[PDB]
Amino acid sequence: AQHAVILDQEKYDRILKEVPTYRYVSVSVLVDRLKIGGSLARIALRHLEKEGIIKPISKHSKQAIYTRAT
Amino acid sequence: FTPVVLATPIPEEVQQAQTEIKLFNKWSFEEVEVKDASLVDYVQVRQPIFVAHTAGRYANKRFRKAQCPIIERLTNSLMMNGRNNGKKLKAVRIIKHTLDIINVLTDQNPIQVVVDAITNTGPREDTTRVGGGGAARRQAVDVSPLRRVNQAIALLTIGAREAAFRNIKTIAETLAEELINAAKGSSTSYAIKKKDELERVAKSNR
Amino acid sequence: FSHPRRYGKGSRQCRVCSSHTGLIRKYGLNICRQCFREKANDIGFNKFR
Amino acid sequence: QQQQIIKIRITLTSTKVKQLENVSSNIVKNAEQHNLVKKGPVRLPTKVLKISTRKTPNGEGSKTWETYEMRIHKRYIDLEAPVQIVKRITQITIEPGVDVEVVVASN
Amino acid sequence: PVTLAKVIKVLGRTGSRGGVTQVRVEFLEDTSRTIVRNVKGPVRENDILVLMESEREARRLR
Amino acid sequence: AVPSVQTFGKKKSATAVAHVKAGKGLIKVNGSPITLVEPEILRFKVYEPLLLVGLDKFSNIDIRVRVTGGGHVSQVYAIRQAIAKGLVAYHQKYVDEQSKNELKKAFTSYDRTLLIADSRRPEPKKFGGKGARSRFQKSYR
RNA sequence: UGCAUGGCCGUUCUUAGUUGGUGGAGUGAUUUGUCUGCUUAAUUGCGAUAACGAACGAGACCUUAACCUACUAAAUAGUGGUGCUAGCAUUUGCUGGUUAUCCACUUCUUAGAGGGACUAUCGGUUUCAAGCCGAUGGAAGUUUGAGGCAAUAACAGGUCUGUGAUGCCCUUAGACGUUCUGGGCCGCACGCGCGCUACACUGACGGAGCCAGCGAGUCUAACCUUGGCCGAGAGGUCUUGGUAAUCUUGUGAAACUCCGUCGUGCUGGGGAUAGAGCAUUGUAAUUAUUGCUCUUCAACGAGGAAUUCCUAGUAAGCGCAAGUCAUCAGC
Ligand SMILES: [Zn+2]
């Protein structure tokens, strides 16, 4: 699979649209469905968390699990 | 809920969890029914536990393993393949994350999903190698309930481990995927594919 | 007719038999492993477990 | 001068438990008979000297090992006594294979 | 269609390597009927087996 | 003086010496609360003594534990039972027996089996292998 | 010269095996006892029974490990108030210094006597025998876990390179005695055995958390080393404790635990090969003793035919001490 290295406006807009639709949100989910970097994916999750778009269930150093904000 | 104030402050969530014994203070053992009557005595759900980490001497007698909490048996089966031997704390943590993921994806008690996965993946018939002076054939034979539970757990944990090997997906995610697929009886699961393969080969050597 | 003999196997020899090989130094014994098993119980080293 | 009460540590060391207990018991009993202030026989942890050798004197055979042990049992008794009584107690209790050291406590 | 059967008696071990146990089982739906079956792994009295064929019987140990 | 019991526990080489008193209600470890147990999962295994029995009995007792020896997971399990023996040894002396049996009943009927030392000690390594049972690899050819 | 031998050790075998008294059978060598069956870890027992009753071996024993608010005592072990004193906080507190300023205990620790387990008690299943299986108590119910010791015998097993244990032979001043210098035992087209490190995401890397047990250690010798100071590090250096339950050492071991950093690519996995430099031990480091710094960054993407070890605190992962040791561990 191709994986993003630079953020990119079209990918940013897709993150904002698609990530709230997902029932389960994690680093892997972003990588698979959004051809994104693993470490872009960690930055994205921290941003979306700060904006209140996603809710954290469990924060571990190796695994962060988020849900959509219902 | 009558919060008790002690000289050392206990979080309310922990005080609430004292009244009812839930797995990881989140998931109840109540309402967890084993759909297969033949596995009821071999799948331990009736004694609840806060964490999947007992130091129980289940190996010292033949069937005392049946009385080991089913989630603990799953935990113990994760900590294999050499480099992971003895790392029970890591395995317990993986299970915590797996149950969190299952909850989010199914909206069902994830303990129930684990039970349903185990009942569905247990092979009913298997082949044994019987040989009579040189030549060996396969003979179809029935599988004991304790063996069904043991094979189910093994197939699930092997499938999840192979799926996680040299993949971006974590072992917690691949195990959750494997359990959900197994609970639904999906032919995508490694465990279901292998069960059906074994039963098909048994039927062919009857 | 002589050279350094301050350390090494050339310095240390067995009390009994004058062999350099297989010495036991532990607790200042200086008895070769073979000779130790001969004179083990005499010294006071007895087997138990 | 003789009547000056001195604080003294008697240290007993032996490989043989029976002799060492007999000597220790005799010192305690003699201290009682003379109404001396005694801190009783403190049993120190037994030192196990362990030597592990190869059984064989040569290269041959299965790699079998022998473990020899020498056990050293150590005890001490603290007494407050005049010099004359101490000399008497030590002389009476000389049993072969029990080593007896006497230390005068100077702070 | 699968038939459930309860283990009423462990008969003994069979097969050249001793990995199979012969058991007598009663059917849960008809307690008048009993058959002999080969079970693979460890088994006890009162265990339940799933039978994919109900009519077949394991040849008795001599 | 105030009532005192000097209970202990153990798993493997861990030896968690508890002290229970007629107190306000502190449940201490080394010199720190129960939330100071860095084994994140094994928080709940040193919780169980005071969870599955009754809160109310833990509102008038100063429990504090001094853990030495052993290893991280043996520390958890040593403390645990030194707590769960502490209240039972307290309730032995200065509480009714019919109450004190309901401590032991609620504990032992959970599949806790606190017991005392889980008697499993290490089987010695003996020569000819890296383990006790395991042997060095044999060659043949 | 181990195929002339002693001693020792390995193996057959740590398997369960071995022998005689009296009786029986047989002219006799010899045989039965010492067995069809069931049972046991066991020639362990039941039982069958021309045998009966015994012995060695097994077992018992001995050492060790798990229980004993019960005894025996202890600053070279440890606790609780007090003497004392520091901070947080007012509520007395809560958390620590001061190891004999001190008192009292001996639960934890030590080791000395004794106790405790005998398959106890109950329910099944069999020659209702030995036993076995289930359940409940109990510290423990797999010979309670582990060893040590280990019969009759044997082998042309190994060792004359452990020995002032040793026969014979050879050699004995230009020595095959001994000692000094240097080299060699390591030498590399290759075949085999035991291993260490790996192939990564259950992972590497960085910060933080932070817990063992068995050890060993110098008086006329340079031993284990704390603390301070210098150093990127290896180390250096000034003092001190310890002949040791006291000091080193709570051997603040490693995996692991948390929060970070990477993102599936031979990649930040892997650390071979190789260059330069700086220390340490030593009379001597070149054919790098070893350590440290930077640089170089190989094969290897889970291993063919084969084949080893293993049933509970066990396998496997993980490091530590000891032995050797001036220095050097993948053992
Ligand atoms: Zn010698």
PDB file of N, CA, C and O (backbone and C1' of nucleotides) in Angstrom, chain A residues 1 3 27 38-39 42 46 59-62, chain G residues 202-203 257-265:
ATOM      1  N   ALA A   1       0.850  -1.216   0.000  1.00  0.00           N
ATOM      2  CA  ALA A   1       0.000   0.000   0.000  1.00  0.00           C
ATOM      3  C   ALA A   1       0.876   1.252   0.000  1.00  0.00           C
ATOM      4  O   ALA A   1       1.901   1.286   0.681  1.00  0.00           O
ATOM      5  N   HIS A   3       1.659   5.066   1.137  1.00  0.00           N
ATOM      6  CA  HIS A   3       1.477   5.748   2.412  1.00  0.00           C
ATOM      7  C   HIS A   3       1.998   7.180   2.315  1.00  0.00           C
ATOM      8  O   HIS A   3       3.094   7.403   1.807  1.00  0.00           O
ATOM      9  N   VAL A  27      -4.602   4.122  14.872  1.00  0.00           N
ATOM     10  CA  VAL A  27      -3.484   4.442  13.988  1.00  0.00           C
ATOM     11  C   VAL A  27      -3.561   3.567  12.730  1.00  0.00           C
ATOM     12  O   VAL A  27      -3.385   4.076  11.625  1.00  0.00           O
ATOM     13  N   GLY A  38       2.064   6.365   9.211  1.00  0.00           N
ATOM     14  CA  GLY A  38       1.790   5.900  10.563  1.00  0.00           C
ATOM     15  C   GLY A  38       1.955   7.024  11.581  1.00  0.00           C
ATOM     16  O   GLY A  38       1.210   7.101  12.555  1.00  0.00           O
ATOM     17  N   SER A  39       2.907   7.919  11.314  1.00  0.00           N
ATOM     18  CA  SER A  39       3.204   9.000  12.231  1.00  0.00           C
ATOM     19  C   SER A  39       2.500  10.290  11.826  1.00  0.00           C
ATOM     20  O   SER A  39       2.252  11.103  12.706  1.00  0.00           O
ATOM     21  N   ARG A  42      -0.680   9.457  13.855  1.00  0.00           N
ATOM     22  CA  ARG A  42      -0.654   9.799  15.275  1.00  0.00           C
ATOM     23  C   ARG A  42      -0.864  11.294  15.529  1.00  0.00           C
ATOM     24  O   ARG A  42      -1.481  11.652  16.531  1.00  0.00           O
ATOM     25  N   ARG A  46      -4.231  13.184  17.478  1.00  0.00           N
ATOM     26  CA  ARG A  46      -4.053  14.203  18.507  1.00  0.00           C
ATOM     27  C   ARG A  46      -4.747  15.519  18.143  1.00  0.00           C
ATOM     28  O   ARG A  46      -5.218  16.213  19.041  1.00  0.00           O
ATOM     29  N   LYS A  59      -5.923   5.306  26.257  1.00  0.00           N
ATOM     30  CA  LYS A  59      -4.642   5.871  25.861  1.00  0.00           C
ATOM     31  C   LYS A  59      -3.517   5.044  26.477  1.00  0.00           C
ATOM     32  O   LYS A  59      -3.281   5.126  27.683  1.00  0.00           O
ATOM     33  N   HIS A  60      -2.863   4.231  25.635  1.00  0.00           N
ATOM     34  CA  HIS A  60      -1.616   3.562  25.966  1.00  0.00           C
ATOM     35  C   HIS A  60      -0.535   4.087  25.021  1.00  0.00           C
ATOM     36  O   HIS A  60      -0.834   4.470  23.892  1.00  0.00           O
ATOM     37  N   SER A  61       0.720   4.075  25.490  1.00  0.00           N
ATOM     38  CA  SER A  61       1.864   4.593  24.750  1.00  0.00           C
ATOM     39  C   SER A  61       2.010   3.945  23.371  1.00  0.00           C
ATOM     40  O   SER A  61       2.406   4.617  22.422  1.00  0.00           O
ATOM     41  N   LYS A  62       1.703   2.641  23.284  1.00  0.00           N
ATOM     42  CA  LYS A  62       1.812   1.851  22.066  1.00  0.00           C
ATOM     43  C   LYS A  62       0.499   1.780  21.282  1.00  0.00           C
ATOM     44  O   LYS A  62       0.547   1.532  20.076  1.00  0.00           O
TER      45      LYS A  62
ATOM     46  P     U G 202       2.240  -6.018  17.394  1.00  0.00           P
ATOM     47  O5'   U G 202       3.165  -6.560  18.581  1.00  0.00           O
ATOM     48  C5'   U G 202       3.523  -5.667  19.672  1.00  0.00           C
ATOM     49  C4'   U G 202       3.946  -6.470  20.879  1.00  0.00           C
ATOM     50  C3'   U G 202       5.401  -6.976  20.902  1.00  0.00           C
ATOM     51  O3'   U G 202       5.908  -6.824  22.229  1.00  0.00           O
ATOM     52  C1'   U G 202       3.957  -8.792  21.131  1.00  0.00           C
ATOM     53  P     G G 203       7.478  -6.832  22.589  1.00  0.00           P
ATOM     54  O5'   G G 203       8.205  -6.433  21.221  1.00  0.00           O
ATOM     55  C5'   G G 203       9.147  -7.338  20.599  1.00  0.00           C
ATOM     56  C4'   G G 203       9.882  -6.617  19.496  1.00  0.00           C
ATOM     57  C3'   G G 203      10.747  -5.425  19.921  1.00  0.00           C
ATOM     58  O3'   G G 203      12.005  -5.887  20.405  1.00  0.00           O
ATOM     59  C1'   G G 203       9.431  -4.852  18.023  1.00  0.00           C
ATOM     60  P     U G 257       5.411  -4.975  29.748  1.00  0.00           P
ATOM     61  O5'   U G 257       5.462  -3.837  30.873  1.00  0.00           O
ATOM     62  C5'   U G 257       4.550  -3.932  32.008  1.00  0.00           C
ATOM     63  C4'   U G 257       4.628  -2.700  32.877  1.00  0.00           C
ATOM     64  C3'   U G 257       4.613  -1.342  32.167  1.00  0.00           C
ATOM     65  O3'   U G 257       3.317  -1.073  31.638  1.00  0.00           O
ATOM     66  C1'   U G 257       6.222  -1.325  33.883  1.00  0.00           C
ATOM     67  P     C G 258       3.078  -0.626  30.107  1.00  0.00           P
ATOM     68  O5'   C G 258       2.730   0.938  30.198  1.00  0.00           O
ATOM     69  C5'   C G 258       1.901   1.481  31.275  1.00  0.00           C
ATOM     70  C4'   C G 258       2.478   2.783  31.789  1.00  0.00           C
ATOM     71  C3'   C G 258       2.737   3.888  30.756  1.00  0.00           C
ATOM     72  O3'   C G 258       1.540   4.621  30.502  1.00  0.00           O
ATOM     73  C1'   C G 258       4.648   3.638  32.140  1.00  0.00           C
ATOM     74  P     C G 259       0.897   4.776  29.033  1.00  0.00           P
ATOM     75  O5'   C G 259       1.625   6.090  28.479  1.00  0.00           O
ATOM     76  C5'   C G 259       1.388   7.381  29.113  1.00  0.00           C
ATOM     77  C4'   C G 259       2.573   8.291  28.882  1.00  0.00           C
ATOM     78  C3'   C G 259       2.960   8.568  27.423  1.00  0.00           C
ATOM     79  O3'   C G 259       2.110   9.572  26.874  1.00  0.00           O
ATOM     80  C1'   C G 259       4.912   8.084  28.716  1.00  0.00           C
ATOM     81  P     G G 260       1.813   9.698  25.296  1.00  0.00           P
ATOM     82  O5'   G G 260       3.182  10.375  24.807  1.00  0.00           O
ATOM     83  C5'   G G 260       3.985   9.748  23.766  1.00  0.00           C
ATOM     84  C4'   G G 260       5.336  10.421  23.709  1.00  0.00           C
ATOM     85  C3'   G G 260       6.147  10.221  22.420  1.00  0.00           C
ATOM     86  O3'   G G 260       5.915  11.293  21.508  1.00  0.00           O
ATOM     87  C1'   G G 260       7.406   9.441  24.262  1.00  0.00           C
ATOM     88  P     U G 261       5.387  11.072  20.002  1.00  0.00           P
ATOM     89  O5'   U G 261       6.699  10.666  19.177  1.00  0.00           O
ATOM     90  C5'   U G 261       7.919  11.464  19.277  1.00  0.00           C
ATOM     91  C4'   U G 261       9.092  10.724  18.666  1.00  0.00           C
ATOM     92  C3'   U G 261       8.793   9.765  17.501  1.00  0.00           C
ATOM     93  O3'   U G 261       8.647  10.448  16.259  1.00  0.00           O
ATOM     94  C1'   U G 261      10.042   8.619  19.103  1.00  0.00           C
ATOM     95  P     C G 262       7.425  10.117  15.263  1.00  0.00           P
ATOM     96  O5'   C G 262       7.994   8.773  14.605  1.00  0.00           O
ATOM     97  C5'   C G 262       9.054   8.874  13.615  1.00  0.00           C
ATOM     98  C4'   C G 262       9.677   7.527  13.327  1.00  0.00           C
ATOM     99  C3'   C G 262       8.945   6.641  12.312  1.00  0.00           C
ATOM    100  O3'   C G 262       9.603   6.807  11.061  1.00  0.00           O
ATOM    101  C1'   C G 262       9.622   5.374  14.286  1.00  0.00           C
ATOM    102  P     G G 263       8.824   7.278   9.740  1.00  0.00           P
ATOM    103  O5'   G G 263       7.975   5.946   9.530  1.00  0.00           O
ATOM    104  C5'   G G 263       8.654   4.762   9.054  1.00  0.00           C
ATOM    105  C4'   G G 263       7.692   3.607   9.133  1.00  0.00           C
ATOM    106  C3'   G G 263       6.412   3.761   8.290  1.00  0.00           C
ATOM    107  O3'   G G 263       6.242   2.680   7.387  1.00  0.00           O
ATOM    108  C1'   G G 263       5.908   3.055  10.474  1.00  0.00           C
ATOM    109  P     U G 264       5.663   2.930   5.911  1.00  0.00           P
ATOM    110  O5'   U G 264       4.693   1.661   5.811  1.00  0.00           O
ATOM    111  C5'   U G 264       4.918   0.649   4.789  1.00  0.00           C
ATOM    112  C4'   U G 264       6.031  -0.271   5.226  1.00  0.00           C
ATOM    113  C3'   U G 264       5.970  -1.711   4.704  1.00  0.00           C
ATOM    114  O3'   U G 264       6.584  -1.733   3.423  1.00  0.00           O
ATOM    115  C1'   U G 264       6.731  -1.579   7.006  1.00  0.00           C
ATOM    116  P     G G 265       6.309  -2.909   2.365  1.00  0.00           P
ATOM    117  O5'   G G 265       7.693  -2.803   1.564  1.00  0.00           O
ATOM    118  C5'   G G 265       8.942  -3.203   2.202  1.00  0.00           C
ATOM    119  C4'   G G 265       9.872  -2.017   2.319  1.00  0.00           C
ATOM    120  C3'   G G 265      11.360  -2.352   2.501  1.00  0.00           C
ATOM    121  O3'   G G 265      12.026  -2.398   1.240  1.00  0.00           O
ATOM    122  C1'   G G 265      10.658  -0.407   3.745  1.00  0.00           C
TER     123        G G 265
END
